[PDB]
Amino acid sequence: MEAGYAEIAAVQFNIAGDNDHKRQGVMEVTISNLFEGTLPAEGGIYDARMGTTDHHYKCITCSHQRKQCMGHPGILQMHAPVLQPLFIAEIRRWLRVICLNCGAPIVDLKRYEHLIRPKRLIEAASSQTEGKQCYVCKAVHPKIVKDSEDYFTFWADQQGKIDKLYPQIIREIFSRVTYDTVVKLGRSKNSHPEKLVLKAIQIPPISIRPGDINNVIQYLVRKNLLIPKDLQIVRGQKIPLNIDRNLQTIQQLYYNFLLDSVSTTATQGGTAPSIMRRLPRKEGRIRKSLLGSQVWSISRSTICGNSDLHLDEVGYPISFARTLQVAETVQHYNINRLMPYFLNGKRQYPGCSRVYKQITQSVHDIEGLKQDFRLEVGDILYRDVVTGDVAFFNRQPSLERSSIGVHRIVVLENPKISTFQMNVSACAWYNADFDGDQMNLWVPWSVMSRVEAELLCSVRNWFISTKSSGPVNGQVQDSTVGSFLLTRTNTPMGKNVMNKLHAMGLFQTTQTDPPCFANYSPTDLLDGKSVVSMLLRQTPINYQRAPTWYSEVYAPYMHYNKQDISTQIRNGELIEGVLDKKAVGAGSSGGIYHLISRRYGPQQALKMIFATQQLALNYVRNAGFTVSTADMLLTPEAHQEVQEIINELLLESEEINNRLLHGDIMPPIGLTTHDFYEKLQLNALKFPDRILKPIMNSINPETNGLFQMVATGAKGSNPNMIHIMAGIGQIEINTQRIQPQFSFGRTLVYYPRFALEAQAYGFICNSYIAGLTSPEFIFGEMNGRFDLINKALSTSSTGYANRKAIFGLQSCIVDYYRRVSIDTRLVQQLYGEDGLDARQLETVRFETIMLSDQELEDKFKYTGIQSPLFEEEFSRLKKDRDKYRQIFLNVENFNFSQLLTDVRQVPVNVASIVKNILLSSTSGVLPFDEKSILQKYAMVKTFCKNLPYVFINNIQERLQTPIPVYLKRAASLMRMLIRIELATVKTLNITCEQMSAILDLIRLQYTQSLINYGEAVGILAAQSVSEPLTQYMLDSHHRSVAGGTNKSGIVRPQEIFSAKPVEAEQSSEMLLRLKNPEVETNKTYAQEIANSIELITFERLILQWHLLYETYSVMYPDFASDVEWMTDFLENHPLLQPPEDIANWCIRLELNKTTMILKSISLESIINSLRAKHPNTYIMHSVENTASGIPIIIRIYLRESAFRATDEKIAVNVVDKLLNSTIRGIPGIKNANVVKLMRHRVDAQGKLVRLDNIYAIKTNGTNIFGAMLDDNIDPYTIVSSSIGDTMELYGIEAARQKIISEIRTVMGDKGPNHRHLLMYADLMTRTGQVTSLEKAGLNAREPSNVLLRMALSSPVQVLTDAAVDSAVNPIYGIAAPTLMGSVPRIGTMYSDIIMDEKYITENY
């Protein structure tokens, strides 16, 4: 007895033979009766020994009730054998490789004794082996035919002799196979073919067939009762007519019981949901019951705003608080507190509903406990939810790490409130809005869950984004506008001041301790900056940034106050500037709340957000804010100005049209006239910058609510205002105008065919306030429908990609070395290459990067002591700068537009620590002290040397044990930052004890920033990269959809994640640098090279071609006039006479003169690119003098050297080969433009200068080899968007860097942290090959993780292959433990807890 605690460590999959069924069966099904009255009939399929599903009886086998009984399998002894439905393909493979007479293998086992085990049998069965002679019994192997009428019948074809392979005969055949043959064919000894035939099937436990799937079982039992029990079928017995039909229907019944309505690739044959149909798809067993679950003790409601709630609070209706209960166990310390809940009971709130008495080991109703007076120790009380309880708040779809957060409950006692109320600043965590969104709320009742909710999942932990490493929450909408209105210097009423009474009223709802106004007279005037400083003095921070209010596009108009365009906060005091989206807005990196979180913790940041939001809202409570129709109304003069601007745009469009009409539009090389015309029209119809002048002439910026919302960043943008007031402009769909889809050349019924006006192609000349006409409204509806379609399918595409990425990355978990490993196989030597949490990073500028050799000496070379130590320190600084420059200039070289930056994300802002210590210092300008300065230098040097020990522990630091090289590299950036910010020049007014404190603070901050052991960093990366994907979809109508540049939708991300080959890429690009640094400046040379490497083939320049059976030294009549220019060619080319091997076959091609002119293709170029290309040929051209009307004709005469298959067919193949020859360019490059490149180079003074005058070729299509062959391109700086090309030519490391770069390009400016891209790239390249995020990548990376691959997709094939291969599935990661009903061993469960026996004995 006493079943001890255990955990499943591995799962073994095997084929279950009839012996296993007999061993595991608790009962034998023998009758067809279902129920004997109110009880199951004994021996039937419902027999209670199989388990109980009804309350009306117990099990018998385990003597448990329905809830505690897991069910037990039975046995049905089949009178005739049946084939295993899941392994029909295995039966077919085994039948074709072993002799059906003696069981010996007909194939040569030595032939396949070099393949891997999972492939030996497949290749053995691939060979024909029909008619092969056995070397043991000299029998002839028949043709194993799979019947096309069903999925299980096999036919033996002996040179036309047809006999049915019955399961009994198959078992006789399979029982003669030795285990030696099984092993030599790559199969496990548990995969002997004798298990593929079942004489005793297993009827599943009733637990999986509750009281249809039992109809099939009943029918199977009934049909099995018909077959005689002594039936003995041998090869060639001629079962007459009815045993045959009965056997076929029994086998079909079993096959439909197991595999009905599921196909699988391993299905051989043709023509009540089954067992295997329950598993797959969203509603299947795995995804619906194992990966997710329905739960109890949970609530859902609509969410609405409540500005009186803190960011970490949620408004809970009281009716829900008396439904969900918290389980508090009564002990000595809580009996007094819990007694009021017990006394209130179910009649008053806060009360309780149930009590679990320990003495009775059962739950007691509160209305039956009226005689208990008090509660006993060990009792469990289920009390109502009260204010201050923690709750899990969740909004679906749950895509971010903050999609589930823990809030403190605020119980709303108003009975008429049924919504989940929350602060509007908390919506950023969930991507929620108050327009109908519903959120799930469940209160943790168990002690462990409550501890975790208040310690691990509180929303204060999600204030900093795991994705972007920046703040998530901030002021939104009314709060941003209110902050601007409160902090602005002047109102339309004069100076922005309030009296003491209204200044006090601003702090009424801040929920903080109010500031002191006793030093203010009732008539004293306080500006908004003063009250903002009063609030922000509690968390003093330093801020200096231009506000969103100041925009350069607005500067020519308006009159910006000089005190409003430079926001400065010094030690919590707002000196100047306004507060808006840049400073207080949500998601504003570097904003005031981000700084507050960095210096005082995210809880302080949330409290400050609430306080400042209350301040702004209380200010607007008096200032007022509104938008009216007149806010969007231009003055008549401004309307005339807008009309004039649009008239100028349409006049430029009409000038382009006039150029087209006169045939003056000449497209460049690479574009057709239609494409060039469309590009010119798109450029001509863009609104100028001066469209804002009429708008701002009609707008009073100090009074305009719409302009104030747009300019302060609260809501809207400049295009919104322009569309509302001036005009929408050109409607662009996928970068192009409206296509003529109504008819041939017609965009709408309202416009004529081949209309040239811009209005016919989507140019909207009217503003929204002016109103749109019917065609303008139709074009706008097309654009809006595009937006709606993209929004709708963004959810689905993001779901697909997110699920694939999660299942590809979920097993990646940080271990105790802070490496990332799948089980035990490494993915990263250190997480994010720095071992840091994404929530603990700060962007910091490195001051030495851009300095020249002289400013570096003038700013960092300390000359106050004549010591070599400071020379060494400056040398160390210079070497750090040089290493940084080299690394991040190399990074520039293998990227398209990744510029070297002065700022880095670091765990510790050293300069801020030094500034804080100096500000708190009770000293200043210390006297010169050589000993102190040298001591501080020594301390800093030792701290830098011992910095990588924060990655190990204090013990190894004390022992000074060797540091691994990768850990030394992990601290390189922090060593650089410390040596810069703690340089001797910068630490002259810092004492030695102050230096010790600074170093201790740096060490503490570095330790606090490390990634936790057991973090599911793969899932974090999957979320952080899948979240920007829906925004990437939302701009799908702003991306090109044409061939060669197809970037619409998820085409590029699916290309990246699926590791699609080069030929499968639709937006391949390459970047080529000229192999001459001094001539990259010439745009003409760059254009020359770009047009030179553009791929031109013979087919591009052919109007038509005709192959002829005529030799030369007769002639198709339609071209008898060709002999004139033919003889002219003979006369003009004396050394090009026809050779004496001229054959009958010859092509005659007409050259397209228009294409030749447009592509600058000369006839001599063709003649030399075909003559010195083709060995067995004789080519002739007409006199190129041809004007319009007479054509250039190229007759290519073949030779029998080519003919050295049907002659005509090989001649046509030769024609195809000749046509595809490369006349000009490099293969695979459809287009090649010239782009201006921004690059950094170190000049002779050691300075890093940003150069804008670099020209490079941005090709369409990739060929790294071809681009590296030409000598006009720098071969060492070829950048191609193709991951496969980079992998094939450069290697797996360059492929990893390319994956990083391409994912970064897809994410865009608002992308995740670099460590998530590193996670994606390192998972995909861990095996030395670029594996995908699809099923194939999982198969390559985790073949043994059968459960994970079943959970991803295709459970039936994965299960079948696992059973056949006898796969052992170790339980690791998340999917495998979850499918086994266990919990993943990560997070809180990554490290186990044991009892400190010594301490417990010595401290009872």
Added chain:
Amino acid sequence: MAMQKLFTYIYEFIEYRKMVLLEEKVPYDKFVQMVLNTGFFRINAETLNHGIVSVFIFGANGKYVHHGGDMRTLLTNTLNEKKHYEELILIVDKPVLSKKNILDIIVEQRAANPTIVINIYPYHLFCINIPKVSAIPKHKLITQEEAQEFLGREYLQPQDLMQISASDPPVVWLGGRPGDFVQIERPSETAMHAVVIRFITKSKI
């Protein structure tokens, strides 16, 4: 321009492998004449371990890459001489790596001489200085003792490490063999460079 780049870069491939050149160096024109006439060019190099490395530069239209019997005869004859022959390198065109028959003779010859290393490589592997490519980080082979101490500190097996193919261009230029360890200094945008150790596995072909 494949043959020119091959000619200029194969010798720096040999030098980067720290191999002393044998015989002499021929001009470009004589090189392509030999490639067209004999069907291939052979370059002999000597390693520091007194072994011999032979590089065979076959032609795209050469007969040795179109008929399997010719390649079999060449490999059997070259392997029948009296030299240590540490490694045989056969540089062929990219579609030659797809013609299964030639790969079959390569495998048969590799099985025939287990102590002899035979590898077939495409043209693009030696058409550029691979270690000088900007996109390729610095790869370096670490001795088995350093790898063993690194694995012992990390409580790791060689099979737990990230894998790299022996046909990886940096690994080929380094001369790494399967079962060896390569230390890679990769540039990092989070830590400003990083160090990773990868396990060299079986080369593709």
Added chain:
Amino acid sequence: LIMDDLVEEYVETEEENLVEIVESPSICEGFVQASSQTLVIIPDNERITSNVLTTFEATRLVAVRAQQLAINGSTMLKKKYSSPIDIAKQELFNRKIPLLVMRCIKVTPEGQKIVEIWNPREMGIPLLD
């Protein structure tokens, strides 16, 4: 005759591409039990894991201690708190928690569970209060 509740036949198409000899002894077939392990505790001076508790480890320690105080309640704390969560948090903060943290570094094939045992009463606590 018209049936509406169709089952939508389900298809899998991407096939997987995973890459003397006697009947069976009592050793190769069987022995699913897996050999027992011995606990190889790394010496305190050879430990390489952090001397600071992770938030996961500290949270798990507090949760375990509070759950144990739910059924037990004999506490070494000085000040009286009315909830097991607060008691466990103060026990961790006062370095009086009776639990230990075992970090399983590696499980060897020979049957050794190499672990590092860490005392939370000599460790850095990252939790808030």
Added chain:
Amino acid sequence: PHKWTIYVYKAVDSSQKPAEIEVTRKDVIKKIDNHYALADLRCSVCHVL
């Protein structure tokens, strides 16, 4: 083609001495105050209002 990148400011009050300031877009914030108003745009090529 015209390039209207010069902003011409007229002094609101006749007491303002310069009475005429021509600036680019990036110079408005540092050279123009409320004593001036935008009068016209001058082309940067033809120097025509």
Added chain:
Amino acid sequence: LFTYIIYDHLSQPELVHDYYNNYKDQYDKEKMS
């Protein structure tokens, strides 16, 4: 000189155009047909 895009130095743009005008004219005629 620099005559590919400037066209404001005169003389050099003019000689090039006058001494290759008819080729451009006939190419334009052929293209737009």
